[PDB]
Write a protein that binds this ligand. Sequence first.
Ligand SMILES: Nc1ncnc2c1ncn2[C@@H]1O[C@H](COP(=O)(O)OP(=O)(O)OP(=O)(O)O)[C@@H](O)[C@H]1O
Ligand SMILES: Nc1ncnc2c1ncn2[C@@H]1O[C@H](COP(=O)(O)OP(=O)(O)OP(=O)(O)O)[C@@H](O)[C@H]1O
Ligand SMILES: [Zn+2]
Ligand SMILES: [Zn+2]
Lengths: 145, 362, 96, 48, 135
Amino acid sequence: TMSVLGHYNNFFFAAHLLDIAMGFKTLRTILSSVTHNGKQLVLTVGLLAVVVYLYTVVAFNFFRKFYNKSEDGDTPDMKCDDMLTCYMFHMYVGVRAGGGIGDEIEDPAGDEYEIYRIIFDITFFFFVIVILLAIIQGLIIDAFG
Amino acid sequence: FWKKIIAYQQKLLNYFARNFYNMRMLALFVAFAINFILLFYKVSTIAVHYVLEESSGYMEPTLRILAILHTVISFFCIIGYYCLKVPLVIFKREKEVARKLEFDGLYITEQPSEDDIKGQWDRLVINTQSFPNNYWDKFVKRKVMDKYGEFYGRDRISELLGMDKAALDFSDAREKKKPKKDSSLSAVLNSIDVKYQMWKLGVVFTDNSFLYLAWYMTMSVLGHYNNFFFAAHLLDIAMGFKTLRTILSSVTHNGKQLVLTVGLLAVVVYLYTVVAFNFFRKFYNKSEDGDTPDMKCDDMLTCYMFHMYVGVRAGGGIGDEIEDPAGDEYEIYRIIFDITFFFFVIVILLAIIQGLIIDAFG
Amino acid sequence: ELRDQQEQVKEDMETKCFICGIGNDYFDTVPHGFETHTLQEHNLANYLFFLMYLINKDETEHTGQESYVWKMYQERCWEFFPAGDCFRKQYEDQLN
Amino acid sequence: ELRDQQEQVKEDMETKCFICGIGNDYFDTVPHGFETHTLQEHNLANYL
Amino acid sequence: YFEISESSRTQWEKPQVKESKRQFIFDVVNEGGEKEKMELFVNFCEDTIFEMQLAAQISESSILTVRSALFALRYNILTLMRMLSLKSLKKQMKKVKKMTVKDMVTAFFSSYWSIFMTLLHFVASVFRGFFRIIC
Ligand SMILES: Nc1ncnc2c1ncn2[C@@H]1O[C@H](COP(=O)(O)OP(=O)(O)OP(=O)(O)O)[C@@H](O)[C@H]1O
Ligand SMILES: Nc1ncnc2c1ncn2[C@@H]1O[C@H](COP(=O)(O)OP(=O)(O)OP(=O)(O)O)[C@@H](O)[C@H]1O
Ligand SMILES: [Zn+2]
Ligand SMILES: [Zn+2]
């Protein structure tokens, strides 16, 4: 089917490069590593999504002034005015960032909620980046092993 | 006239005990429903008002119906737990109480160490007449009397466990049959051993699962005051699923080592902050505008907080954030400072903490 | 590896007897068999107190066993220490 | 794995006799039993 | 069979000898030579005997939280027992004896709700006692 669709669009032939992953034993094992612990990997991702959801719920209620993401003062771009937008931003830009959500959101120095936001960012970094992502990676790697 | 109310109460009791798990399942489903509806909850604009935004327009009454349903189902879950599993806990605790009371005399020969809540609280139940209420062996009192009384005084053991002597002799002797009065309100109420009920309620309150189900109900109630409090009920899956339970237990598995290592990290970053506050302070300016210099290390507490937060989170280390040392007289000293910070704090200690948690899970 | 070595030390100490070196399984046939072997029969405290007792006692009053052990320790040979064998192994057929 | 193989080689060499292959426990009944077996009885230098 | 002195037992039970035995057991099991195991044990015995003879010369020439928790349980459960001790529930039940199934179920629910409020009062009192302890 991919071979046929390649005639309609030549770039569809790129999917045929995945056949080496079947041909070679090591690549086959690498792919099977993901499906080896599929239930645990789905459950841990769900736990991560729940934790980042609780963090987003706290942020949407208490820390909203720190989520402005526009350099130009005329147009304020708020990423946490809406529940869905704040959750999407926490899922994407917060999870990818190595330091955590505090690397992206605005500095708390001098604010009344300074210690609260410091604890918020530190706990985010510890629980999400340090622990849960490491759990997922360890699951995949040790399944391969 | 009460033989009907007891039967109906028994029917409700059995229904809740039978459907305890299904109600706990329904509560989690309703918890997912409420939090999924809450995902479309925006701000509207002085005080700011939070309003649900949707195209259908029937989400708002549904959010109230689901909240009320969750609050009712949670209460039914506590009721079902009390119907089902509380009697098992009481039967167990009452059985080990008799075991300790008889075999090694933990309330006659040797006394509890007073630092355990269980031993101190179990002193109350032995005096109660309604003992082995759930336990099979109704003559543990007789056994303890026969096995310790001669040594410690028959009548004194009798008063310690609250026995009576005339009843055994009377029952062994001749007796008559007399119809009783079921209407006696004073007799019915006094038959209820308030001391034994006190002990049982203490046991139930000290039970961990009952505390968890009470916290669940408390969050369910607070959800009515603030709808966002229903988000805490999404943590129930972490209890329901075994893998999530193990993931959470991984943190508490090595709690002592994890606390000690965090303390070591806080001491190391404190020594680094002490060195910085004394020698390298000009490099901690963090303001782009020249008019207002923002110093993060003029004060000991501020410098330590900055090192704890912005230095630890940064992957490279403190030198990624503080100002470049090129051309300064302290260039080599600050280079060594930053390199040692990166090696000891980021590379080693944080890796130790992460490895502790991950290998505890493993 | 350091933590694993500490854990292995503790596990070896709970599962092996330090003096004779026999496994706890050979003793645990009876209830609390290994505990009885490590407390009544082979105990480090008892050996140390035996050494103190022979140091404190007079030479002329040593018994046959005490004089044997005293000469053995003076010449610094440790054959008197049980090596893989115990009282139960020595009299296994008669005792059982 | 390479480091573990080196360590395993050294441990096998200290606990096993290379020629006969019998365990050191069977020889260590007497003091220095394995050393005496590896020096006086079975020795690579002596075979060479 | 031989004699062990009670003084020797006490000096063995002294914490310093316990720490020394910790260190010696760890050292011997981790790296003590099997051929030298007995030699090291006898050396440690001599060292410990000297340490005992030195310790002799040198020597001779929470609960409040459990208290609070027990008091909290007693007070918070006696608070609910006061409901029955008022004895005024009988007059109210005189009314319930003649009314219907919905209201009898309502009383059934009210009992458990009262129990849950008693638990909440208990846990709040526990927290307050803990604040007084830490402060
Ligand atoms: N020859 C031996 N003498 C004594 N204990 C031995 C011997 N061989 C093995 N053991 C074991 O070593 C351990 C020594 O006792 P144990 O360490 O429990 O007491 P301790 O020194 O008071 O320390 P702790 O009670 O804190 O563990 C016991 O588990 C015992 O079974
Ligand atoms: N047949 C054997 N001949 C010699 N050594 C043997 C034999 N079987 C086992 N071994 C063991 O192999 C080791 C060889 O001696 P060893 O390696 O100690 O001496 P080396 O070659 O001088 O090196 P080094 O002293 O630096 O370790 C010893 O531990 C010895 O017990
Ligand atoms: Zn032994
Ligand atoms: Zn050989």
